[PDB]
Amino acid sequence: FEGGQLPLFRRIPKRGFTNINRKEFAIVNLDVLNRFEDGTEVTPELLVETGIIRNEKSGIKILSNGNIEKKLTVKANKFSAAAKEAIEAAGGKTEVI
Amino acid sequence: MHVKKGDKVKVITGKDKGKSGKVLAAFPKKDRVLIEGINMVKKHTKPSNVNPQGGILNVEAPIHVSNVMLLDPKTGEPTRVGYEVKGDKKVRVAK
RNA sequence: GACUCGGUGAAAUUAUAGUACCUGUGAAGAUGCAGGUUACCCGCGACAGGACGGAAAGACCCCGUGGAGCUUUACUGCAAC
RNA sequence: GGUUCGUGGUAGGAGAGCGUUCUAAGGGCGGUGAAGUCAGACCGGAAGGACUGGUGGAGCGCUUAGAAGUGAGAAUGCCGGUAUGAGUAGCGAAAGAAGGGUGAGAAUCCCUUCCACCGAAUAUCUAAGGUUUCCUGAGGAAGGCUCGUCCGCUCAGGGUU
RNA sequence: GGGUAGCGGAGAAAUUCCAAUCGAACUUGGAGAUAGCUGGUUCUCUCCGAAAUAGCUUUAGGGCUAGCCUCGAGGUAAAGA
RNA sequence: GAGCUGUACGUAAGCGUUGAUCCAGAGAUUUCCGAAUGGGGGAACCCACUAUCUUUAGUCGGAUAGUAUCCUUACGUGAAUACAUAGCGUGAGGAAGGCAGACCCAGGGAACUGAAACAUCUAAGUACCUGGAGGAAGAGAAAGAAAAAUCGAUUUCCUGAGUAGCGGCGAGCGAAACGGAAAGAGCCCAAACCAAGAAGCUUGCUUCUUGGGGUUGUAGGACACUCUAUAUGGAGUUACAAAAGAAAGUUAUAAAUGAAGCGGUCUGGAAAGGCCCGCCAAAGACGGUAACAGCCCGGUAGUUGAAAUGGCUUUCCCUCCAGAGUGGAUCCUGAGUACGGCGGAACACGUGAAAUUCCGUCGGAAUCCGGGAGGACCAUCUCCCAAGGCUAAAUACUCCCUAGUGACCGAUAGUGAACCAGUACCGUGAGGGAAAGGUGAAAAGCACCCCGGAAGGGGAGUGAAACAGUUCCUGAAACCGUGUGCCUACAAGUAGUUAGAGCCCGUUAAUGGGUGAUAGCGUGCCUUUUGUAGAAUGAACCGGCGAGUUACGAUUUGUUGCAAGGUUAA
Numbered sequence A: 001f002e003g004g005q006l007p008l009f010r011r012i013p014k015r016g017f018t019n020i021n022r023k024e025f026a027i028v029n030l031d032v033l034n035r036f037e038d039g040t041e042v043t044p045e046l047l048v049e050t051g052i053i054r055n056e057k058s059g060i061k062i063l064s065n066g067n068i069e070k071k072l073t074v075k076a077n078k079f080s081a082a083a084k085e086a087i088e089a090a091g092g093k094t095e096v097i
Numbered sequence B: 001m002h003v004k005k006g007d008k009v010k011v012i013t014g015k016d017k018g019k020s021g022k023v024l025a026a027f028p029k030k031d032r033v034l035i036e037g038i039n040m041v042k043k044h045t046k047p048s049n050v051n052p053q054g055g056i057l058n059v060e061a062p063i064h065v066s067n068v069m070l071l072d073p074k075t076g077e078p079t080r081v082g083y084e085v086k087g088d089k090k091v092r093v094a095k
Numbered sequence C: 001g002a003c004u005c006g007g008u009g010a011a012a013u014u015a016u017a018g019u020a021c022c023u024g025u026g027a028a029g030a031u032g033c034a035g036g037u038u039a040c041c042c043g044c045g046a047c048a049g050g051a052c053g054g055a056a057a058g059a060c061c062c063c064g065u066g067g068a069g070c071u072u073u074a075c076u077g078c079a080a081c
Numbered sequence D: 001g002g003u004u005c006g007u008g009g010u011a012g013g014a015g016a017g018c019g020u021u022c023u024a025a026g027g028g029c030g031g032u033g034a035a036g037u038c039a040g041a042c043c044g045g046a047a048g049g050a051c052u053g054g055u056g057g058a059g060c061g062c063u064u065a066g067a068a069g070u071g072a073g074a075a076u077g078c079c080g081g082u083a084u085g086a087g088u089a090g091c092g093a094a095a096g097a098a099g100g101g102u103g104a105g106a107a108u109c110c111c112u113u114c115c116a117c118c119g120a121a122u123a124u125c126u127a128a129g130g131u132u133u134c135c136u137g138a139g140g141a142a143g144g145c146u147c148g149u150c151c152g153c154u155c156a157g158g159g160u161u
Numbered sequence E: 001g002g003g004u005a006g007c008g009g010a011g012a013a014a015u016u017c018c019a020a021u022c023g024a025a026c027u028u029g030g031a032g033a034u035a036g037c038u039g040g041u042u043c044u045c046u047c048c049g050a051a052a053u054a055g056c057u058u059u060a061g062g063g064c065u066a067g068c069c070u071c072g073a074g075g076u077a078a079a080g081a
Numbered sequence F: 001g002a003g004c005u006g007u008a009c010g011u012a013a014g015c016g017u018u019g020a021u022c023c024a025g026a027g028a029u030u031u032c033c034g035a036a037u038g039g040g041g042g043a044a045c046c047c048a049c050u051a052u053c054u055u056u057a058g059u060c061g062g063a064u065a066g067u068a069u070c071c072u073u074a075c076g077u078g079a080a081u082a083c084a085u086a087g088c089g090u091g092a093g094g095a096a097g098g099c100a101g102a103c104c105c106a107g108g109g110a111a112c113u114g115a116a117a118c119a120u121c122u123a124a125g126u127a128c129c130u131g132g133a134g135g136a137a138g139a140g141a142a143a144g145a146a147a148a149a150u151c152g153a154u155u156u157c158c159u160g161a162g163u164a165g166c167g168g169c170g171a172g173c174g175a176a177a178c179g180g181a182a183a184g185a186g187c188c189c190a191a192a193c194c195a196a197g198a199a200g201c202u203u204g205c206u207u208c209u210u211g212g213g214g215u216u217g218u219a220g221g222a223c224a225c226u227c228u229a230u231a232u233g234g235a236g237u238u239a240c241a242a243a244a245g246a247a248a249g250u251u252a253u254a255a256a257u258g259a260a261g262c263g264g265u266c267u268g269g270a271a272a273g274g275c276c277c278g279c280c281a282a283a284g285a286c287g288g289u290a291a292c293a294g295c296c297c298g299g300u301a302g303u304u305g306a307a308a309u310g311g312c313u314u315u316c317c318c319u320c321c322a323g324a325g326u327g328g329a330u331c332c333u334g335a336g337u338a339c340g341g342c343g344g345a346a347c348a349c350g351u352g353a354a355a356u357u358c359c360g361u362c363g364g365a366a367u368c369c370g371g372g373a374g375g376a377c378c379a380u381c382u383c384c385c386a387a388g389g390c391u392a393a394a395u396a397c398u399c400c401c402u403a404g405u406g407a408c409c410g411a412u413a414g415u416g417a418a419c420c421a422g423u424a425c426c427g428u429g430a431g432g433g434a435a436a437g438g439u440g441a442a443a444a445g446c447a448c449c450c451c452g453g454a455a456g457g458g459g460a461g462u463g464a465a466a467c468a469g470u471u472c473c474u475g476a477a478a479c480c481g482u483g484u485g486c487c488u489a490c491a492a493g494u495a496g497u498u499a500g501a502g503c504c505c506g507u508u509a510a511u512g513g514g515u516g517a518u519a520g521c522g523u524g525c526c527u528u529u530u531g532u533a534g535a536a537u538g539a540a541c542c543g544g545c546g547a548g549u550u551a552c553g554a555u556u557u558g559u560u561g562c563a564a565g566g567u568u569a570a
């Protein structure tokens, strides 16, 4: 309340809408994949057991942030272009389940 | 109550401990007893009442029951009381 | 009726009070502050100038985005027709 | 531990504490006198705390922590007590007097006589309403605007066909 | 002896009366209504210490942001005086 | 198992081991009023009638029983009106009223208030009124939730989430499903059709009653055949049909038994306390007892106990009972219903793009080749099968009962009420509504003397104490007095303070205490104010009571644990 001066929130317009079908992915940066042993097949189920992602909202997306050392086989619902390149640049294969 | 009128009790507490007497009356609603020659009090009595010369009367006042123990004629000592059944009615027993 | 004596015995009010006057000063009108001027201690009958005396959180006046009653071509309604 | 600069203060911010009730644990006091209460010229920078003695007559400190119905001088605060005004206002329309009696005690109760007042009422019935106030015998704390031996008051008995 | 009852009665009309209440009875409840108003708010010491302004406001004795106070922390061509 | 005839401070007359008083179960009695019910009535009263009996010479009296109204239902009478209906009468059943100021469901339904005004909105479907209840109610076995590809009645909790939304898009309002739990349980009809009547006479077709049958979705049933049951088995009074009994066990409602110190000594009125010795403990709970007790008393642990009544659990009795398969000719599967328009409401959802659910009104389907839903609507797909009913548990609340608990109160508190309190008292009434606890261990409650009419005192006595004396533990302050150390009748006083003689004392022993001639200085406290000694406010005084709290969220600082992790809720 501003003692009758029109409050800030009414001086400015409402914006946008909420999407009923909004997908939010559980994010996994490369750095945490170094945790795993070399030549290992990283699944969502393996990513929740280990305790890296607890709730797999809409799916698991792999993002680049950090740098991967080990040569893995990572299967996730989505990969960033950079993440895919980086997983491969190390000497691994990405699959999109 | 562990004693009743007629019982020979020893007094174990008060100005009269060590003294024994007969139980003249029991007041179980007050949990008190009247022992012969125990707890004598001087009652300042007006003539009016049954006592046509009044006067300072010296009589027994009631003691609390928990202040007397029963006397066993065999030993002649203060004893706690047990209850044992002969067959028809139960009876008090010394220990 | 008042007053004196004998009997009985309230109340409003009340920060504590050993509670003068004048001129001044000061929230601008002082028993209470300053400078003076008066004044032995305690009462009783009287009078009301002051204690901005008592009584009543001013009814006047204004204020409150307080009430309430009333009015109408104020607004929105409702009954009834 | 020194040095330097500081230490007026309302609203208000910050800090450290005192004391109250209760709980826990530890350790105590107490009928050779607990708490409370009264008094004192004692101690601490403050809130406060002891000691000694009286009263009191059975419970209470201390330490560390914990929890709060935790601190009053003001609210025309609420309840209680007690002042002040003050031996003051008042004692509610009115005619009494003396003698005798009763009694611990009498202007005030009883009796007598005179006086005075109402008399289309201040008399006699009676409805309402009240509900025992009626009668008798005791009483005199309170009530009665004084007094009181008296009473519509107190206590007993009675009483309405 | 009865009747009319509160968003109502009754009024030879005064806002008059409806149990010492009437521009809308009384009582209980909603109810601790609401009160930008008035009053009040209880132990101690130590350190610091304002404001009574601007802007906007059915706003003007209220409020909000800023200004001015305080506590903590940070950071350096020290930018303050 | 020895006393008893209630409080409470009595007098009297009595009872009791040939078992009283007392405790528990079960009976009997139970005036009048009150729904109040034979009629009336100003509750606790008045007045009857009809039978039967009783009393008297008969009136006059007495006793017992019946006699309200409505609903349902038999039967009988029976009008206008012929049959008949209404009406009237009799007999059965049933209802009526109350309340736990709670919880539940329904009908009806505010305003203050918030929105810094106010009208939509909020408060709130709350308060309140009315009805219905039940021990719980409501809900409930999908015309559901969904769309991880599946789940499988309802309810309640955690979560989702202050999210999605709603909203003068303001103030505010605010889900649900998924996920995790508690608890779990499923059933009966209507209709096809079959049988038996009954009627209408549509006169062999139709609709009405009773019984069988039958209960559901890529369907189920009827209907055809077929296999086994016709109590072999199974199931029950908590739904799934409904009444009955027994017996045994167990719990409740009285009780019983129950270890160990009269230990010594000290203080004391008294010992349970101190000191010194013992002992019991499945018992060191609590209370009482002359101060604080495991061993004094009632008890406590443990172990026993019920004639009678009630509850529960089992078992028996009793009662009741068909359930698989195969086809798909036909038939059935809830109509003034669903739905729609108009007007409202409920849905978190304010008419909105408004699905879903309900009410009024009007219109009004399909009916298995069928119908509904998936948030306007259409198509596809998916999931369901409405217009009938029942259903325990997990949930809510507490007038009560039993046993317990409390960093809850301790007499201005705690209930309004510790006490004869919803009393006294106030009010026409609805209604409002107090104050008021403590002798002592024990009455031992003050014989007797004295003054006084008494009250009240002073002795004497009791008692540990009477300065504990029947309202009597303690006994503060205001306030009222008596006594007297210092001062005071020439003084002008916010009453003190600083200096200070004199006089009087003698301490928590201190560069002490009381008083104060005289001298200097000095306008209370609080509130509110630019500014108050204020001629502004508040307080007569003393005492007690009397105001930032808690819950749930947000945020920030401190602390601690763990740390790319941390943490669980129910």
Ligand SMILES: [Mg+2]
Pocket (backbone or CB within 6 Å): none
């Ligand atoms: Mg006089």
Ligand SMILES: [Mg+2]
Pocket (backbone or CB within 6 Å): C028
């Ligand atoms: Mg001037």
Ligand SMILES: [Mg+2]
Pocket (backbone or CB within 6 Å): C030
């Ligand atoms: Mg002047």
Ligand SMILES: [Mg+2]
Pocket (backbone or CB within 6 Å): none
């Ligand atoms: Mg002067």
Ligand SMILES: [Mg+2]
Pocket (backbone or CB within 6 Å): none
């Ligand atoms: Mg003055």
Ligand SMILES: [Mg+2]
Pocket (backbone or CB within 6 Å): none
């Ligand atoms: Mg005045």
Ligand SMILES: [Mg+2]
Pocket (backbone or CB within 6 Å): C057
């Ligand atoms: Mg005023």
Ligand SMILES: [Mg+2]
Pocket (backbone or CB within 6 Å): none
């Ligand atoms: Mg005014």
Ligand SMILES: [Mg+2]
Pocket (backbone or CB within 6 Å): D008
């Ligand atoms: Mg200074």
Ligand SMILES: [Mg+2]
Pocket (backbone or CB within 6 Å): none
């Ligand atoms: Mg300072």
Ligand SMILES: [Mg+2]
Pocket (backbone or CB within 6 Å): none
């Ligand atoms: Mg602070």
Ligand SMILES: [Mg+2]
Pocket (backbone or CB within 6 Å): none
């Ligand atoms: Mg205490």
Ligand SMILES: [Mg+2]
Pocket (backbone or CB within 6 Å): D036, D037, F474, F475, F476
């Ligand atoms: Mg005291």
Ligand SMILES: [Mg+2]
Pocket (backbone or CB within 6 Å): none
């Ligand atoms: Mg307080």
Ligand SMILES: [Mg+2]
Pocket (backbone or CB within 6 Å): none
């Ligand atoms: Mg006071």
Ligand SMILES: [Mg+2]
Pocket (backbone or CB within 6 Å): D088
């Ligand atoms: Mg005077």
